[PDB]
Amino acid sequence: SIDSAVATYEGFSIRVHKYADGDANVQKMRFDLLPAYVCFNPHMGGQFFGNP
């Protein structure tokens, strides 16, 4: 029971919602996204800098 829409940017879909909580002419919009991460092997990457 809330009107919404979907916006896509670089292959990421963003859910946008609209509602009018409060009767002081105060509209509200919100955007959501939920990612997930995983580290397979720590021994295959890291940091580096220069050496003298």
């Binding site: 829409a5 609209k18 009018a20």
Partner: protein, 157 residues
């Protein structure tokens, strides 16, 4: 400076020559308390018929003091004083003169002019919005937004 209470009563007393240096009469302390009580009663009544004008009521439960500050702007002193003078003239069983009535009417009219607001009638709510406004879905722009019911969820039913 600061428009204190009590001196507004002195204003009316002087203006009708109840107690002023012009008539050589001295102020009676028994009348000033009645004047201040009448002033507070008249302002309390004025809270509804005209709008609020910034009057500061006595905090707590105690009688007012004649030397406290009223808080009213200096542009309302004539109006307030003339109104309370008209309301307390009957105490001494005296009849006001036409010039005093005219001055009080003029001051009251100016005060009412100051705190004036005219409402504007907004759209009904079922009034269509023309095609030239380019309405769109996901927005309620198809029709004019009336007064929202503000009843949602389980508490409406």
């Amino acid at each position: 400076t600061v428009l204190t209470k009590g001196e507004i009563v002195l204003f009316a007393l002087r203006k009708f020559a109840i107690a002023s240096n012009a008539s050589l009469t001295d102020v009676e302390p028994q009348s000033i308390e009645d004047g201040v009580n009448d002033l507070e009663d008249m302002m309390s009544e004025w809270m509804i018929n005209p709008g609020d004008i910034g009057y500061a009521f006595a905090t707590g439960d105690e009688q007012p003091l004649p030397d406290d500050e009223s808080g009213l702007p200096r542009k309302y002193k004539h109006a307030v004083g003339y109104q309370l003078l008209l309301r307390m003239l009957s105490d001494y069983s005296l009849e006001p003169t036409p010039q005093v009535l005219s001055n009080a009417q003029r001051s009251y009219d100016a005060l009412m002019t100051d705190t004036l607001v005219v409402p504007s009638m907004r759209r009904r709510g079922d009034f269509p919005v023309g095609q030239g406004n380019k309405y769109d879905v996901f927005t309620s722009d198809r029709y004019y937004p009336g007064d929202l019911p503000l009843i949602d969820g389980d508490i409406p039913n």
